[PDB]
Amino acid sequence: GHMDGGAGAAVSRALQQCGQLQKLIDISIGSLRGLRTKCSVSNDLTQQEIRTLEAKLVKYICKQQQSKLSVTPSDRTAELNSYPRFSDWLYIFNVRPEVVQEIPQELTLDALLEMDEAKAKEMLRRWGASTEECSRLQQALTCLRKVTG
């Protein structure tokens, strides 16, 4: 409710970065994409760069619920309403993609951000998140609803 209401010339700041640029999300995530599989790196400072890239990526994927203050959440686009993509979201903190593959296709982050934290904990725990694993996740999933907006 602060300049949002019409995603016209304001949508560009959420939409160019939705796909057109694809450097911010992909290139930053490529670094962790490598790290998720290849953890033998001789470059310590890059482990820290990657650490930044991960946290930074949340600002790119969840910007559409944060920067929705300029781009109406009721407008954005179907694509912008599909963000943050669970696949491109859980990969940032590792929310066990092993577990997310057990989730029914109708239920996605779309519905996860929609559910209660207590409820989500029990959902995740029913998909393979093994109790403490879920708690580790919950603390990171909460970042979504704490990304401002």
From Swiss-Prot:
Subcellular location: Cytoplasm; Membrane; Cell membrane; Cell projection, Ruffle membrane
S-S bridge residues: none
Domain of life of the organism encoding this protein: Eukaryota
Post-translational changes noted in the entry: Phosphorylated KSR1 is cytoplasmic and dephosphorylated KSR1 is membrane-associated.
Region (Mediates association with membranes): 4-149
Tissue-specificity statement: Expressed in brain, spleen and testis. Isoform 1 is highly expressed spleen and weakly in testis, and isoform 2 is highly expressed in brain and weakly in testis.
Coiled coil regions, renumbered to chain: none
Complex formation: Homodimer. Heterodimerizes (via N-terminus) with BRAF (via N-terminus) in a MAP2K1/MEK1 or MAP2K2/MEK2-dependent manner. Interacts with MAP2K1/MEK1 and MAP2K2/MEK2. Binding to MAP2K1/MEK1 releases the intramolecular inhibitory interaction between KSR1 N-terminus and kinase domains which is required for the subsequent RSK1 dimerization with BRAF. Identified in a complex with AKAP13, MAP2K1 and BRAF. Interacts with AKAP13 and BRAF. Interacts with RAF and MAPK/ERK, in a Ras-dependent manner. Interacts with 14-3-3 proteins including YWHAB. Interacts with HSP90AA1/HSP90, YWHAE/14-3-3 and CDC37.
Family per record: Belongs to the protein kinase superfamily. TKL Ser/Thr protein kinase family.
Protein task: Part of a multiprotein signaling complex which promotes phosphorylation of Raf family members and activation of downstream MAP kinases. Independently of its kinase activity, acts as MAP2K1/MEK1 and MAP2K2/MEK2-dependent allosteric activator of BRAF; upon binding to MAP2K1/MEK1 or MAP2K2/MEK2, dimerizes with BRAF and promotes BRAF-mediated phosphorylation of MAP2K1/MEK1 and/or MAP2K2/MEK2. Promotes activation of MAPK1 and/or MAPK3, both in response to EGF and to cAMP. Its kinase activity is unsure.
Domain-related comment: The protein kinase domain is predicted to be catalytically inactive. The domain is sufficient for KSR1 and KSR1-mediated MAP2K1 and MAP2K2 membrane localization. The domain is required but not sufficient for MAP kinase-mediated inhibition of ELK1 phosphorylation. The N-terminal region mediates interaction with BRAF. Also mediates membrane localization.
Protein name: Kinase suppressor of Ras 1
Native source organism of the sequence: Mus musculus (Mouse)
Gene: Ksr1
Residue numbers of the full-length protein present here: 25 to 170 of 873
